[PDB]
Amino acid sequence: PAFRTFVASDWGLTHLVVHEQTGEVYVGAVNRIYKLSGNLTLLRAHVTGPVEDNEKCYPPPSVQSCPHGLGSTDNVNKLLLLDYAANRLLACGSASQGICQFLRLDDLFKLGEPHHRKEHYLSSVREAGSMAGVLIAGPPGQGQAKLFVGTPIDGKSEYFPTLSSRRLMANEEDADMFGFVYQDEFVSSQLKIPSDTLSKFPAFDIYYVYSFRSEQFVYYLTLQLDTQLAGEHFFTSKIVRLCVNDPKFYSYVEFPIGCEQAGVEYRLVQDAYLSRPGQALAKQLGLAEDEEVLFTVFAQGQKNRVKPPKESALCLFTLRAIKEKIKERIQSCYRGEGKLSLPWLLNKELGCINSPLQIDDDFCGQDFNQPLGGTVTIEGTPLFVDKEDGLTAVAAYDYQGRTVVFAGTRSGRIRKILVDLANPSGRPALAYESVVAQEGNPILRDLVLSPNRQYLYAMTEKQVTQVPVESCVQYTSCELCLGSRDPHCGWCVLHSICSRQDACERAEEPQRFASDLLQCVQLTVQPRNVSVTMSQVPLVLQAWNVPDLSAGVNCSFEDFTETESILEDGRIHCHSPSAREVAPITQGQGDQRVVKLYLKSKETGKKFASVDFVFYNCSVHQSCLACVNGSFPCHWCKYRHVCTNNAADCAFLEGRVNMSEDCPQILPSTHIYVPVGVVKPITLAARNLPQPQSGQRGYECLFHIPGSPARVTALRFNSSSLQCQNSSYSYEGNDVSDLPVNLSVVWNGNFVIDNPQNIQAHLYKCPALRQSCGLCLKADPRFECGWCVAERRCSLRHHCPADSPASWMHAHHGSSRCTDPKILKLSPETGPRQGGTRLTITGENLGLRFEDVRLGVHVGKVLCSPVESEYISAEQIVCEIGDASTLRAHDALVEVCVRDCSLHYRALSPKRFTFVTPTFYRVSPSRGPLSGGTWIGIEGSHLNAGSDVAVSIGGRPCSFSWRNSREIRCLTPPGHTPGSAPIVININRAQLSNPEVKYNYTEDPTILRIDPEWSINSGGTLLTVTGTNLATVREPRIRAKYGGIERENSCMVYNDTTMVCRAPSIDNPKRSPPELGERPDEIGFIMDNVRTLLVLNSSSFLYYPDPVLEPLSSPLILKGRNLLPPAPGNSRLNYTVLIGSTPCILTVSETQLLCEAPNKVTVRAGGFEFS
């Protein structure tokens, strides 16, 4: 569905109201007043707006000339009131000292607009909604129609009354309009602001928010100023009341109003709405039918009426309770107690006069003790509190007793609240939230339910929106319908839809309509699971919370089939579809198809109740495991090798599989080892292997080798063992020694027995991977594969001739020395004399255990201790070299003795290991900031030696980058205290020092001045920067943060104090700098780890928008915008206008460039160029 809507094409909207007969919607706006249909189509548009005028002018230009300058200004609709009696609309504007309009009801024809007399003027105030009031009428000939109206005054105390009682004549042209009900030279039916109270408190004013007629009175919810709370402005939200029949204005009352939530004050009215409570809230709030109630909205505190806080609270007042607070206060002043206490009205406090009277609710005020205030602030019952999104508006209504509340939000959202304090629940609960102007257009106070009370017109700054009170049809399921709780919604069982009682046909009958989730349609089928192969199966259906279906019912499995059913007891009996019908469904979905079996009612003809119904298919299972150990009742036939539901369809009795453990499967043994090109049998074990029956062949082993697949026939010895016959196998590659191969055991040609563990045959080759004795004895003792001296190759005893009783050698337990060790290459080629180096030797024919190579390794004379974990047997030794300080040699060859330094069992390295002692002499900055982060370049000799390197400045470690013969480059850590620091480099067990080469911690560079204090949006101009220690940073750069973007640019250092920098581009398509200029969010410099320089607090650097220049003996004149910026001091751009290469002498002006020419033209200023 879509929300019916009226969009405000050009201007903001201010007020909305609904005609109780028609449902036409009238809409007050700035410069416009619209008539709209119930579904928000435009019906008529009145122009009321842009008027040539001025607020300062009294009587507006129409009546008298004003010396103040006039301008086309907007006319804001301040007020809107339906006068049904005189078939019209009072449409009160502003911007003419507040003259009022009369528009005819059905066409908006201006009937009248009185503006001659002073009463025809209402207020200068140009603010929308700060005004309110009520229209009240009697029959024609009797006491005529009156308007009670409050407005702000703006300090124009003597021009306008804030509250007034005014006359509404039947002729709109009649001059008597908006005249006071009773005017006297002593007392008029109006209430003015006293001049003395405006002198004392400068801009006190009364803003009228909401207003309503009740029984015989007229109430107003108001906002006022600090008068006992010159200083600052703080507001107090109050209730006002008058008797309708009090021309003298003596009935005026004024009590402060608000409410508190866990010690948090809410004292600013944003809206209100008088309503009924209906049977529900009335009863447990203790009220009579026609007793009224007032829903309200307050913001937190007493601050900023112009822009209130998010924190907002919906409170409640029963009018009987406000009536009692007023009666209680009057029966109190008529006891003579205290003062009247009304600051803004009576500055000097007059006292309460005692008198004997019958104080009633009918009391309409008397001559003495006059207009009076209120001491005890009236507290309201809180209901719902929003903390992240401020309430703005409210309405409410009676629905079948339960009291529904509507609440606008700053976001453009409406809340639908059941108030349940008087209802059973713990506290009043939100039911639902809805969207109007999602982008964040706030909802306005004027929020009216339609006449039929089916919709709720919700107004924003920019759009009216028809939001339905009931729209239960968005609810798809009984479970969600009654789950939303918004009380209009019930499940109309047989129509399977969610809607109100009056909308569900026959709802009054038993079980036809559901209102509590427990009434939900609940359905079950006895034979939940039915096989594809079955047909017309009898099923029984149990359903609860369903009306009398003696009308008739059909079963529809989905929109595929439909079978007739008959009714007995509390059960429904229908049949499954035919095999002819069932399979059209199940085709494609294979294993099973869960299908939603519905009930189609004969009365409605709509599916309402559902169940999970399963269509299972046994035959499509193509293995025992899937068949039995699946999820369903399926039987496997060992012998036919087919899955089916029927026991009898099996071959015969003793071939039925019902249990998963009884399935034909191959069991594992310890791994199947198969050498290539060797005649071997492969015995297998298994379980429940079938005796092949009539017309059935025997067993075979099929090997799935990509190169060659072998078919070898086998013998089944019993139900538990197999064996493929003597054969040899191969694969073409010689690429991988150990190849695992999928094998399938077949019988009768194509029946493959199940292989759960997925047992494989490993085809291994006596080595196509190992041409070294050490590699063979390295591999599995299982393979039986071993090294054969004479051949110079490696194969089994089987494949190698015994010319000697010990000609074939196998690693017995690894106690097998292996001949002629050889070293290929070793890493680190160089090392420190001190030792500690990890030598990484890689050979081919080494020892097979660690404890023989340990003690064997030596570097010339120097004892080398080998490492266990890092040793890879007969391929690689990792060894730690000892102290070589005492060695005379500079370089020595590496030696391994396998176990004993025997003459055949020794290896010597092809090239030799070199000992050096690295030294360093210079550092390439010798200075750097205390924070660190400096790129250091240590120069020396032999710096690339050994394994590990660690550089320590002041004991603290340097972050290493890269190493060289001649250089070590690392990044400096933070220094503790500024000044000279030791540089310690340790390579393995060698720790080299130099006290002549030190590092000097500085002092951190500083930034003092940037000279020009500005640049343009694209940047690129020269900046003459000054500071200290600038030569100690090799690559400094400028940083600037504009908006959400951060950008950087380069610098060129000259002195320790001077630097030229190219200004950073801030080019943002989101924000452009103004003509006036703008500071960046951040500005600074990136200098290593000195982070205090990244953000400059004191900087006044400005960014102007991207010079503008216009193209095509007398001098050159070049015109354009943005040539000169509004910069502090003298400082301006050094412009140079050039011709091919020759610069000119020019005088620069704000719009023009005065170059001088003797008769390709380029203009330069910093990093800027244009032709």
Ligand SMILES: *[C@@H]1O[C@H](CO)[C@@H](O[C@@H]2O[C@H](CO)[C@@H](O[C@@H]3O[C@H](CO[C@H]4O[C@H](CO)[C@@H](O)[C@H](O[C@H]5O[C@H](CO)[C@@H](O)[C@H](O)[C@@H]5O)[C@@H]4O)[C@@H](O)[C@H](O[C@H]4O[C@H](CO)[C@@H](O)[C@H](O)[C@@H]4O)[C@@H]3O)[C@H](O)[C@H]2NC(C)=O)[C@H](O)[C@H]1NC(C)=O
């Ligand atoms: C429950 O589930 C079962 C199994 O999943 C469904 O039964 C299948 O029905 C469909 C028909 O729509 C079959 O698919 C078609 O197969 C034919 C050729 O089938 C041949 O190959 C089979 C596969 O090995 C083999 O089983 C067949 O032998 C059977 O039939 C004989 C005689 O009745 C019987 O004695 C045997 O015991 C077997 O039962 C047969 O040799 C093929 O023409 C189709 O392929 C074409 O279309 C596809 C898709 O467009 C396309 O990709 C191809 O290129 C080709 O053009 C098609 O695949 C399927 O074979 C049946 N399954 C089995 C095991 O037989 C069935 O939906 C459900 N059962 C019921 C009762 O509803």
Ligand SMILES: *[C@H]1O[C@H](CO)[C@@H](O[C@@H]2O[C@H](CO)[C@@H](O[C@@H]3O[C@H](CO[C@H]4O[C@H](CO)[C@@H](O)[C@H](O[C@H]5O[C@H](CO)[C@@H](O)[C@H](O)[C@@H]5O)[C@@H]4O)[C@@H](O)[C@H](O[C@H]4O[C@H](CO)[C@@H](O)[C@H](O)[C@@H]4O)[C@@H]3O)[C@H](O)[C@H]2NC(C)=O)[C@H](O)[C@H]1NC(C)=O
């Ligand atoms: C290290 O190197 C840096 C930059 O490389 C040096 O900074 C500059 O030094 C030179 C001298 O070596 C100075 O140039 C001289 O300027 C004067 C006239 O100054 C006027 O013109 C300037 C250039 O347009 C302008 O910036 C000046 O504005 C400054 O002063 C105002 C007001 O006091 C101040 O508010 C600003 O902040 C500016 O700082 C000013 O209007 C000129 O007379 C010199 O000419 C002489 O020298 C040349 C060459 O030797 C010779 O040929 C002539 O005959 C003549 O005798 C010269 O052009 C420049 O002022 C320095 N820049 C700054 C920003 O101060 C820096 O001095 C070196 N540092 C160290 C520690 O050694």
Ligand SMILES: *[C@@H]1O[C@H](CO)[C@@H](O[C@@H]2O[C@H](CO)[C@@H](O[C@@H]3O[C@H](CO[C@H]4O[C@H](CO)[C@@H](O)[C@H](O)[C@@H]4O)[C@@H](O)[C@H](O[C@H]4O[C@H](CO)[C@@H](O)[C@H](O)[C@@H]4O)[C@@H]3O)[C@H](O)[C@H]2NC(C)=O)[C@H](O)[C@H]1NC(C)=O
């Ligand atoms: C289903 O059918 C399967 C397969 O047909 C049977 O499995 C066989 O079980 C028997 C036990 O009866 C196993 O027989 C044993 O074989 C050993 C032979 O290994 C040697 O083979 C060759 C040639 O002799 C040598 O070169 C090689 O070096 C091996 O050493 C014998 O050593 C065993 O004999 C020992 O046990 C018996 C009985 O206790 C004693 O009498 C002997 O003195 C001796 O101690 C033994 O005979 C045979 O390996 C299995 N077959 C296969 C093919 O592997 C199942 O028994 C049967 N299952 C059921 C439930 O009925």
Ligand SMILES: *[C@@H]1O[C@H](CO)[C@@H](O[C@@H]2O[C@H](CO)[C@@H](O[C@@H]3O[C@H](CO[C@H]4O[C@H](CO)[C@@H](O)[C@H](O[C@H]5O[C@H](CO)[C@@H](O)[C@H](O)[C@@H]5O)[C@@H]4O)[C@@H](O)[C@H](O)[C@@H]3O)[C@H](O)[C@H]2NC(C)=O)[C@H](O)[C@H]1NC(C)=O
């Ligand atoms: C497929 O659909 C069928 C619909 O028929 C579902 O079957 C029902 O499954 C549930 C459990 O999953 C059973 O509920 C249990 O009942 C137990 C008591 O069982 C006895 O009483 C049964 C009814 O009175 C009776 O059917 C049953 O006899 C069965 O066993 C006999 C011996 O094996 C066999 O010969 C008969 O044919 C028959 O099948 C017992 O005497 C109780 O102890 C449990 O706590 C539980 O409540 C239903 O009884 C099943 N209904 C039937 C008619 O058997 C089935 O769930 C669906 N399959 C899947 C996978 O979802």
Ligand SMILES: *[C@@H]1O[C@H](CO)[C@@H](O[C@@H]2O[C@H](CO)[C@@H](O[C@@H]3O[C@H](CO)[C@@H](O)[C@H](O[C@H]4O[C@H](CO)[C@@H](O)[C@H](O)[C@@H]4O)[C@@H]3O)[C@H](O)[C@H]2NC(C)=O)[C@H](O)[C@H]1NC(C)=O
């Ligand atoms: C102005 O607003 C009015 C209402 O304020 C509105 O006119 C109404 O439209 C509704 C439908 O939106 C109509 O209600 C129909 O009543 C007839 C019986 O006479 C039914 O046959 C209709 O049922 C149909 O629609 C159902 C729901 O979509 C279907 O389930 C069903 O199969 C039928 O097709 C329906 O209930 C109604 O005619 C008027 N209301 C009145 C009082 O006449 C309209 O949307 C707005 N018009 C304009 C010009 O802006």
Ligand SMILES: *[C@@H]1O[C@H](CO)[C@@H](O[C@@H]2O[C@H](CO)[C@@H](O[C@@H]3O[C@H](CO)[C@@H](O)[C@H](O[C@H]4O[C@H](CO)[C@@H](O)[C@H](O)[C@@H]4O)[C@@H]3O)[C@H](O)[C@H]2NC(C)=O)[C@H](O)[C@H]1NC(C)=O
């Ligand atoms: C509840 O269930 C009952 C019984 O299960 C079911 O009755 C069905 O009624 C339809 C008529 O609506 C029957 O279909 C007819 O059968 C004749 C042959 O005898 C066909 O030639 C007709 O089919 C034509 O029309 C179809 C629909 O327009 C087309 O799809 C088709 O191409 C043909 O032109 C005709 O429809 C049907 O035989 C019975 N069902 C059975 C199982 O016999 C009924 O739907 C349900 N009852 C109610 C009141 O809804």
Ligand SMILES: *[C@@H]1O[C@H](CO)[C@@H](O[C@@H]2O[C@H](CO)[C@@H](O[C@@H]3O[C@H](CO)[C@@H](O)[C@H](O)[C@@H]3O)[C@H](O)[C@H]2NC(C)=O)[C@H](O)[C@H]1NC(C)=O
């Ligand atoms: C040797 O056998 C192995 C294992 O049987 C084969 O590898 C894998 O085979 C399995 C079948 O069990 C495949 O798994 C499948 O996964 C999908 C997941 O979407 C699932 O839907 C299927 O039901 C099935 O279980 C798997 O794809 C396959 N592996 C690869 C990488 O394809 C292997 O194919 C055999 N080797 C050769 C050379 O054929």
Ligand SMILES: *[C@@H]1O[C@H](CO)[C@@H](O[C@@H]2O[C@H](CO)[C@@H](O)[C@H](O)[C@H]2NC(C)=O)[C@H](O)[C@H]1NC(C)=O
């Ligand atoms: C066959 O069914 C068995 C028994 O139900 C399944 O056994 C599972 O085995 C794993 C071990 O791999 C256990 O951790 C699970 O707890 C077992 N599951 C259950 C439910 O008992 C097995 O998954 C099924 N196998 C196949 C191939 O379908």
Ligand SMILES: *[C@@H]1O[C@H](CO)[C@@H](O)[C@H](O)[C@H]1NC(C)=O
């Ligand atoms: C072949 O297998 C048979 C039976 O297992 C056995 O007697 C014979 O030793 C095997 N022959 C060869 C050459 O391996």
Ligand SMILES: *[C@@H]1O[C@H](CO)[C@@H](O)[C@H](O)[C@H]1NC(C)=O
């Ligand atoms: C270290 O640097 C500081 C600040 O630049 C300097 O004053 C001091 O002389 C330097 N120390 C040495 C030993 O040169």
